[PDB]
A paper describes a structure:
The capsid is composed of 72 capsomers, each containing five copies of L1, the major capsid protein. For each copy of L1 a loop of the C-terminus forms a connecting arm by extending to a neighboring capsomer, forming a stabilizing disulfide bond, and returning to the donating capsomer.
Here, we purified a native mouse papillomavirus (MmuPV1), for which we have used ISECC to obtain high resolution maps and made a comparison for the first time between native papillomavirus and lab generated capsids. The subparticle refinements were recombined into an icosahedral capsid with 3.3 Å resolution overall (ISECC_Recombine), a dramatic improvement over the original 4.4 Å map. The L1 protein structure was reliably visualized from Thr16–Ala481. Despite the sequence deviation between HPV and MmuPV1 (53% identity) there is structural conservation of the secondary, tertiary, and quaternary structures. Each copy of L1 has a C-terminal loop region spanning Trp 406–Trp 451 and five of these connecting arms extend from each capsomer, independent of whether the capsomer is in the hexavalent or pentavalent icosahedral environment. Each of these loop regions extends to interact with a neighboring capsomer and these interactions are stabilized by a disulfide bond between Cys 432 of the connecting arm and Cys 173 of the neighboring capsomer.
Residue numbers in the entry:
A (entry chain F): 460 to 483
B (entry chain B): 17 to 482
C (entry chain C): 205 to 357
D (entry chain F): 307 to 408
E (entry chain F): 103 to 153
F (entry chain A): 409 to 459
G (entry chain D): 256 to 306
C-alpha cells in the first residue's frame, strides 16, 4: 500500500522523516 | 463519495488555549485477594487482588453546555466542543511490596529441578504450593475500552473422545475492571482449558487471565482504544515442577538426539516413564521505587494513532495494572473468649485482606470542531453516536398525528389505553463492568491550585498571574 | 495497626508486633493547598519475597467449593491424605536486597530551588521538620558479658 | 531488554548490499526465548461425574502459542542496465538477470 | 524500515527429559556415592535466554 | 460514492483452513459481490494476465 | 539468618505489641520456653566486578 499514515509502522516512518500527510 | 484514508484529529479539531484540571478525591478499595466472600449470593467481601485490571471509566461534563462568560469564540450553530486529554497522573498510595498466591491442592507431583532418585505415583498427589506471580505494571489511556487477548477452547472440526486435548483459539475481548492480568502461566481461559481446577493458584483457577492486545490496539483504523501506553514486566523461573495425571500424549519411542529407540528395560525402577508435563513457578523479582511507572505526570503531546487525545463522547478509559503494591495483609481475630492465657490454634481466626489506593488527576484542553458537510460525513462514518450526542443530525422526519386522548382512561365503556412502552435504552457498554469515576462536578480552571495543574504550568512555562 | 488487627500477637516480628507501621501519605501531603507538610522529598524502596509460608489457626473464611479454591476445589474426599485443606492464608517473608554505597540518598547536599507546592521553603513559625528513614545502616551489634566470672577455663 | 515491537530503520547496511531485496525476496530470522510460556491444559475426558479427585482421571497436555506480525517499509529503486552493470549483476547472481530479461 | 510484532505475554518455559543422564549432584556432595544400570533421572531446566 | 462504514473490515484469516477445531471454513454465504450469473454455465475465459 | 546461644540478658516483655496482648505457649509441651531472640545475620559482599 502507498497510503503510509494508515498503518502503525507507516506513520512511524512518516513521523521519523517529518513527511506529514497533507491536511485536506 | 465522501472520503477514504483516516486523517489525524489535528486537521478538523481546532484547539483552544483553555485548560481545565479535573481529579478524583481518592479511590480506595478493600477486599479479599483470592476469592469473593459471599453468604450464599450477595457479596460480603469482594475480590480485590493486586493482579487485577483496574479499568477506570471517567465521565466528563459535556463542554457544549458549559456556561462560558464570552462564548464569542465558538458558534453553537456551526461548531461543537470536545475535551482533549493533555496531562494525566495516576497516583498510587500504598507502600511497595510483593504478595503471594497459592492453592491448597495444587497439581504438582514432585520437584524436578534436581531429583536425588527416581519416583512414584498414586491417587491425589496434590500439594499445598504458593508462589509470587510475574511482576507487571501497565497503563493504557484511550476514549474506547481496551482490547485484551487470551487463549480459549474452540469447537473442533470433528468429534473427539472423553479426555482429549481442547483446541486453542486466540479470543479477543474487552478488558474489564476486575479481570485478572497474566501472572506467568500464560493468557488462557483456566475455567475451560483446565478441568482439573488445581492447575494454577486460587485467584486465577476459575478466571480468565488476559493480556492487552497491543498488536490489534495500535493497528485499528482510528486509534481510539489507546493513544498512550506504558508497560514494565519481569519474571524468572523460581522452581521447576511436574504435573500428575494420565499422560495425554506419550513421549515418542524414538530418540532424535541419538537416532535410536530407547526404553528403561535394563533398569526395573525407570521402566514406567515419569511425567514429562512440566511447569515452572513464576517469580517477579525485587520491586524498586526507581522502576516505577506510576506517581509521575504524563504529557500527551503526540498520540500513537490518528486520535491525538480527543475524548470523544465525553468519556475516557484509564487501564492500570500494578503488581508492585500487592501486599496482602494478614488479619486475625480472637474468637470464643478474650480470656485465655495460653496460645491455641483453635482460638484464633486468620483472615486475608488487600487494600488498593488510587488518585487520578487530568489536564483537559477544550477544542472546537466546526461541523462543515465533509467533517460531518467523516465524523458520522467514524462514529454515529458522536453526532447523535451532539444535537445537529437527525433533522425531524415526520409530521404531527392525532392520538385521540380518551378522557376517562380507566373506564369499561372504551377499549384499553395502556401504551406508555419504553424504558430508557441508551448505554451500549452496559454489559461491561468498569470502575466508573464521575468527574462532571470536578472540573476547575484554577490549575495553580492543584498538584498536576501547577506541574503542567511549570512544564509549559506559564507562571500564575501575580 | 498490628496491635488491634492481629490479636494473635505473633503474626509479625517483635519490633512491629505491637507497633503501628505507617507509610507517608504522599497523595495527601502533596494535595494540601499551601504545601507546608512537605516541600521536598525523596524515596528509595525495594523488596523481594524471600520465603513463602502459611498461617496456623482456625480458618476464617473457608475456601468456596466452586472454582475459586483452584486445586483444592476438587475435594480429595476419597483420599485419607488431603480430605482437610491446608491453610490458604499465605504470607511471604520480605527481604530488602543488597545495600550499596551508590544508591545512598544521604551525605549529599540538596538545594531547594523550586518546591513542589506553593510554600517555596519558607520556614513559617521559625520551625522545620526533617523526616528520615535509613534502613541501610540498621546493623544490630551483638554484645556479651561474662557474668558468672572470667575464672573458669 | 526487548528487541521486538520496535521499528528499525535501515539507514545503511553492514555490507555492500544496502538493503536491496534481490529476486523480490526477504528473509526475516527471529528467535525469541522471552515468550516461551508453555500453557499446561488438562481435560476431564475420562472423568464426567466424579466429585473426588483421582489422578487416573485427568489427562494432562502441553501447548505453546506463538504470535507474530511483520511490518515493513519498502522503497522502489531503479537500476539502469548498461553493459557494465549487466556483466556485474551476472557475475553477482545470474538468477537476477535470468528472472528479469536482457 | 522493518518492525517485528510479538503478541504473547512475557514468560519463561521449561523443558526436560523423563530419563536424563545425570549420576549425582556435584555442586555440593556431603560424601561419596555409588552407581548401577540405568541411573537416569527426571530432570527439567530453563534454557539459555536468546533473542 | 462510498465512505468506510464505522465498523471496519478487518478479516480474521487462519493459516490452515481445513484443520479440525477452528469452527468452520468460515466462508459459506456468498453475500458480497456475487454476479447473478451464478446459475448459468459459460466457457469462463480469464484474460486478466493476457493484456 | 542465625541465633545466639547463652543466658538471656533481657527477656522478651510479657506483652505483644502486634496483638496488644500477653502471650505464652503454656498450652503446649514445646514452646513453653522461648528460643533465643538474639538474631544475627552473616554478611555477604556480592559479585566483585572489574567495572
Amino acid at each position: 500500500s502507498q497510503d503510509l499514515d494508515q498503518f502503525a509502522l507507516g506513520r512511524k516512518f512518516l513521523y521519523q522523516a517529518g513527511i506529514r500527510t497533507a491536511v485536506t | 463519495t465522501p472520503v477514504a484514508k483516516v486523517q489525524s484529529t489535528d486537521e478538523y479539531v481546532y484547539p483552544t488555549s483553555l485548560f481545565c484540571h479535573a481529579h478524583t478525591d481518592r479511590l480506595l478499595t478493600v477486599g479479599h485477594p483470592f476469592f469473593s466472600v459471599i453468604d450464599n449470593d450477595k457479596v460480603t467481601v469482594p475480590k480485590v487482588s493486586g493482579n487485577q485490571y483496574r479499568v477506570f471509566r471517567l465521565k466528563f461534563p459535556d463542554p457544549n453546555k458549559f456556561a462560558l462568560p464570552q462564548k464569542d469564540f465558538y458558534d453553537p450553530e456551526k461548531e461543537r466542543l470536545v475535551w482533549r486529554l493533555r496531562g494525566l497522573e495516576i497516583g498510587r498510595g500504598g507502600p511497595l511490596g510483593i504478595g503471594t498466591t497459592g492453592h491448597p491442592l495444587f497439581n504438582k507431583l514432585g520437584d524436578t529441578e534436581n531429583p536425588n532418585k527416581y519416583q512414584q505415583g498414586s491417587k491425589d498427589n496434590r500439594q499445598n504450593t504458593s508462589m509470587d506471580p510475574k511482576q507487571t505494571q501497565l497503563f493504557i489511556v484511550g476514549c474506547e475500552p481496551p482490547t485484551g487477548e487470551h487463549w480459549d477452547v474452540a469447537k473442533p472440526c470433528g468429534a473427539l473422545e472423553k479426555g482429549d486435548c481442547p483446541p486453542i483459539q486466540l479470543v479477543n475481548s474487552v478488558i474489564e475492571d476486575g479481570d485478572m492480568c497474566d501472572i506467568g502461566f500464560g493468557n488462557m481461559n483456566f475455567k475451560e482449558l483446565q478441568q482439573d481446577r488445581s492447575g494454577v493458584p486460587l485467584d486465577i483457577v476459575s478466571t480468565r487471565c488476559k493480556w492487552p492486545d497491543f498488536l490489534k490496539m495500535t493497528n485499528e483504523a482510528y486509534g481510539d482504544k489507546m493513544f498512550f501506553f506504558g508497560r514494565r514486566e519481569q519474571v524468572y523461573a523460581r522452581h521447576f515442577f511436574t504435573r500428575n495425571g494420565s499422560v495425554g500424549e506419550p513421549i515418542p519411542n524414538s530418540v532424535s538426539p541419538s537416532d535410536f529407540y530407547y526404553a528403561p528395560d535394563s533398569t526395573q525402577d525407570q521402566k514406567t516413564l515419569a511425567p514429562s508435563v512440566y511447569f515452572g513457578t513464576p517469580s517477579g523479582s525485587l520491586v524498586s521505587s526507581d522502576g516505577q511507572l506510576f506517581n509521575r505526570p504524563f504529557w500527551l503531546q503526540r498520540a500513537q494513532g490518528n486520535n491525538n487525545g480527543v475524548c470523544w463522547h465525553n468519556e475516557l478509559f484509564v487501564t492500570v495494572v500494578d503488581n508492585t503494591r500487592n501486599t496482602n495483609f494478614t488479619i486475625s481475630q480472637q474468637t470464643n473468649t478474650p480470656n485465655p492465657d495460653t496460645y491455641d490454634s483453635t482460638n484464633f481466626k486468620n483472615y486475608l485482606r488487600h487494600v488498593e489506593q488510587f488518585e487520578l488527576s487530568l489536564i483537559a484542553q477544550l477544542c472546537k470542531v466546526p461541523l462543515d458537510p465533509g467533517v460531518l460525513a467523516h465524523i458520522n462514518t467514524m462514529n454515529p453516536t458522536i453526532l447523535e450526542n451532539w444535537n445537529l443530525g437527525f433533522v425531524p422526519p415526520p409530521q404531527q398525528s392525532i392520538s385521540d386522548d380518551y378522557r376517562y382512561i380507566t373506564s369499561s365503556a372504551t377499549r384499553c389505553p395502556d401504551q406508555n412502552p419504553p424504558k430508557e435504552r441508551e448505554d451500549p457498554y452496559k454489559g461491561l463492568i468498569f470502575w466508573e469515576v464521575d468527574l462532571t462536578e470536578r472540573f476547575s480552571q484554577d490549575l495553580d491550585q492543584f498538584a498536576l495543574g501547577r506541574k503542567f504550568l511549570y512544564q509549559a512555562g506559564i507562571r500564575t498571574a501575580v
